[PDB]
Design a protein around this nucleic acid. Structure first.
Ligand SMILES: [Ca+2]
Ligand SMILES: [Ca+2]
Lengths: 280, 7, 280, 7
DNA sequence: ATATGAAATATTGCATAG
DNA sequence: CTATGCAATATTTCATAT
């Protein structure tokens, strides 16, 4: 693997250090030479040292270890993610399709493209909910490992959303509960937790379980405030207003929730979402 | 049910 | 070493895998054995595979590599961080002090402790600004490496704040600019970037550079919205209101910023900050 | 200048 | 299912050379 | 400053054993 090597050399030159300087208290300068030429994989001790001195998150050296064009792929991923957030499914569909037809080998990145492409296809009504789900399940059946440990959970969340908005509330709700459970086990990804609770809350609400919906909503609002996340907080206040209405709370409490939602939709420029707020 | 599910 | 080993074994057992199962497509079962007994450090390929199948961020295995009690330490850091956010310096001073007096050896965690203890000592007026700055500079002079790539910059931000609020605007402003420059070189830490620009905007304002202050505020607010962070956004709106007033904008523009700040202070329960909003 | 610097 | 000796591979340090 | 032979260390596999 010569890709790791030149990434280390590139960043060392960029930092103005020589091999001798870099090797200090870590290893011999000749081992740095051999690491940069690709002739050797470094041990944990040595890598940890090099990453520290160069001020590079260690996962970076693993990322560039096998597949190419890692910086561009990461910006691509963040772009798609932003667009998905904005519900710009047409663009996602085109953007991801273009990338997909390069036919490059990189299972985890290819899986990400396919996941996003299918969801986009489904939202655009180019494919039916049942076919989307089956394709998504097939990505799962890949049992793909990968750098991003949460990718399968993200695919399960899409699957659960699609069951839920096509009448299969029980199946959707049970899948949401499984995701929250699998999350208990994994390291903290609290933004995702908030997102799953939100979708789950929507499904509970569609199933007329108003109290449980509000439970999930308030839990997710609490998590959002504690981590200072605005990603879903507008939607959550809106949802909580919905629950408050069905549960027959006082009009003021109901109005409060919707005002808080309208606040976030405004400042975050969520134009689409602003419609739902008619007559409340 | 105007707000979409979040993918 | 023994720590990595038993940590891999613990997580494997937790996942109900056997050494053979874990080893499939990665390495021989006997190497998993020798890795768990701490006889060997595993190579990047093998570690990478093991982390993927076990769904652990690979940094986790490096964190546990050398020093003990890593989970407790990380929760401690998170608590200190939240308290700092809340300006609960008394509690920070006590909490950190108890931890420091254990005299455990762990340079990076040591440094984090001292950094927070001095800042708290400084804010509680137990020590003068000049002594605090000197002690912080001594931590920098450690040239400490470590897992948290940003810690030195965090300490720099503290030093700059202290210069700024003790009349040394020029030295403060200049150190803020160095920090922002060092960030563009490092991997993204956009929340930190927002905090630095905020502190900088405060210094600029104290130096009567109202237009540059507003520039930093608006830049920081734009980053805040893009990354969906609320951490500093109320303060930013307040500060935007401050500059708008000095630059003699229309009263409605000014009142807008202040209302927006009042909104975030309410929902984030920033009671302290609400004081500053009297008469506007 | 009532708001504090953010440490 | 795990663990260990012994052989086979892979790394790193030290001397030295361009 | 970097790179490479070669010796010294370290890891991994394969064959077994408990
Ligand atoms: Ca090799
Ligand atoms: Ca060893």
């Amino acid at each position: 693997a010569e890709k790791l090597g030149s990434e280390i050399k590139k960043i060392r030159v960029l930092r103005g250090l020589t091999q001798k300087q870099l090797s200090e208290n870590i290893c011999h300068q000749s081992e740095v030479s051999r690491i940069e030429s690709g002739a050797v994989y470094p041990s944990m001790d040595i890598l940890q040292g090099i990453a520290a001195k160069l001020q590079i998150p260690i996962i970076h050296f693993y990322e560039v270890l096998i597949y190419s064009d890692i910086e561009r792929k990461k910006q691509f991923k963040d772009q798609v993610i932003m667009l998905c957030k904005q519900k710009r499914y047409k663009e996602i569909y085109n953007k991801v399709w273009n990338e997909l037809k390069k036919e490059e080998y990189h299972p985890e990145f290819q899986q990400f493209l396919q996941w996003q492409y299918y969801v986009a296809a489904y939202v655009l009504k180019k494919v039916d909910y049942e076919y989307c789900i089956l394709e998504l399940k097939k990505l799962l059946n890949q049992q793909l490992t990968g750098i991003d440990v949460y990718q399968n959970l993200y695919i399960e969340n899409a699957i659960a959303n699609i069951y839920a908005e096509n009448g299969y509330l029980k199946k959707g709700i049970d899948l949401f509960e499984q995701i929250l459970k699998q999350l208990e086990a994994l390291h903290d990804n609290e933004e995702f937790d908030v997102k799953v609770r939100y979708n789950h809350a929507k499904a509970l609400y569609l199933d007329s379980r108003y109290e449980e919906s509000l439970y999930q909503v308030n839990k997710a609002i609490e998590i959002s405030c504690r981590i200072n996340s605005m990603a879903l907080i507008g939607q959550l206040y809106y949802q909580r207003g919905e629950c408050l209405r069905k549960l027959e709370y006082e009009e003021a409490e109901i109005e409060d929730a919707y005002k808080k939602a309208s606040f976030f939709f405004d400042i975050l420029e969520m134009h689409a979402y602003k419609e739902a707020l008619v007559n409340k | 049910a105007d707000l979409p599910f979040e993918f």
